[PDB]
Design a protein around this ligand. Structure first.
Ligand SMILES: Nc1ncnc2c1ncn2[C@@H]1O[C@H](COP(=O)(O)OP(=O)(O)CP(=O)(O)O)[C@@H](O)[C@H]1O
Ligand SMILES: Nc1ncnc2c1ncn2[C@@H]1O[C@H](COP(=O)(O)OP(=O)(O)CP(=O)(O)O)[C@@H](O)[C@H]1O
Ligand SMILES: [Ca+2]
Ligand SMILES: [Ca+2]
Lengths: 211, 203
């Protein structure tokens, strides 16, 4: 009887579990709306500057419009991939995943666990995940590293992930395509990428927690 | 443990409609982003060939950006809008209170209309009928809701008298803006009574 009630509690907890998935999808959609909104404003501003510059400075006006096109192109490209499922890669899951890739590659995985980033958007998590996966894939294909260190830090208004390997960088002076892919999606989020290849390869990727 | 479960399920189920409204915003914002992409590109191609036409396209880009953000702004937090079935009932009730005769011949209900576009049409219908009650002195108000080919058309016709000037273009501008946002339209005939036709694409 309570016997049978405890049953209904679990059916209830099971449906709450599925429903929470919808809630994460609702959160991802919201993140899309916020980002599309901001890019829409930015484009607004740049096209307005361009209009004010059509006579004063036509070449600068063409440059602003070219930045408008690029913003549009790359916004649609990042949303396109997400819109049907409204699901991305979680950072906890990717971190596990790259551990497994490193183990199969027999490259030692160094990770010191510290405060996990608390209030990161599903969009920005997906971006950082895809970048971490790309940085580590590269470690495995190209570095000949013996170790690979991942640091994930919640700094002030930003999350910074560092992937450092102690192999050798095999790219040219102008290796700028996984690498451009990373830079684009991070700059789309108002973040950044830095590469040091001086002794091993160090990628630092930074992304605002929100907007 | 049990009581609270279904109280949590009872709300989280509401995400189903909210999740739909959010996809509708993402789709609309996407489209307006593309359209701004295209217009700014045409503007760029015209900087030297036709500067004044370039300026015009960029002004259209600004407008599109402004009004888009204005429509979304109101919906984003709640992700909830008015349903057309519920507004139809509501305007019945306003007309009854106003003692204006509500004429509605029921026909095929629009089947595949976006929540966003429903919310727009609802707010336009509510405005049209509010106006009927405040200004028309009509005895009848007829509302027609028609699924035409790729568009839904709602006609609100009263047999009172139009009290506005020649340039009454602010509920009316509100209507025209939000319908043009959705790629729809508004027409007013005030010849004998006031007739508003509002049209919006389904998706
Ligand atoms: N961790 C790393 N260690 C050593 N070399 C690396 C590295 N990551 C990248 N590289 C070098 O930089 C080049 C560019 O890498 P990038 O990922 O940009 O394109 P790719 O060369 O892996 C083909 P793709 O990325 O398109 O699969 C690689 O070919 C490799 O030479
Ligand atoms: N169905 C109708 N019958 C008679 N007059 C109408 C009418 N609809 C609109 N009007 C007239 O047009 C004017 C403009 O309508 P609109 O709704 O744009 O602004 P409003 O005058 O109602 C202030 P608000 O929009 O805040 O109510 C009204 O004041 C009224 O003169
Ligand atoms: Ca690569
Ligand atoms: Ca009004």
């Amino acid at each position: 009887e309570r016997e049978r009630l405890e049953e209904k509690l679990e059916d209830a907890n099971e449906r709450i579990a599925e429903l929470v998935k919808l809630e994460e999808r609702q959160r991802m959609a919201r993140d899309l709306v916020d980002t599309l909104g901001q890019k829409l404003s930015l484009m607004g501003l740049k096209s307005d500057l361009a209009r004010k510059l059509i006579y004063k400075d036509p070449e600068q006006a063409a440059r602003e419009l070219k930045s408008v096109q690029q913003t549009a192109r790359t916004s649609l490209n990042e949303v396109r991939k997400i819109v049907s499922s409204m699901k991305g890669i979680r950072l906890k899951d990717e971190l596990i995943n790259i551990k497994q890739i490193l183990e199969a590659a027999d490259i030692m995985f160094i990770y010191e666990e510290e405060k996990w980033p608390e209030n990161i958007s599903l969009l920005n998590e997906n971006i950082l995940s895809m970048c971490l996966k790309e940085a580590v894939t590269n470690v495995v294909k190209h570095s000949q590293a013996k170790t690979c260190r991942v640091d994930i830090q919640q700094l002030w208004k930003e999350v910074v992930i560092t992937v450092s390997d102690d192999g050798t960088f095999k790219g040219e002076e102008n290796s700028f395509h996984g690498l451009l892919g990373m830079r684009e999606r991070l700059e789309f989020a108002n973040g950044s990428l830095h590469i040091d290849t001086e002794n091993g390869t160090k990628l630092t990727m930074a992304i605002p927690n929100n907007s």
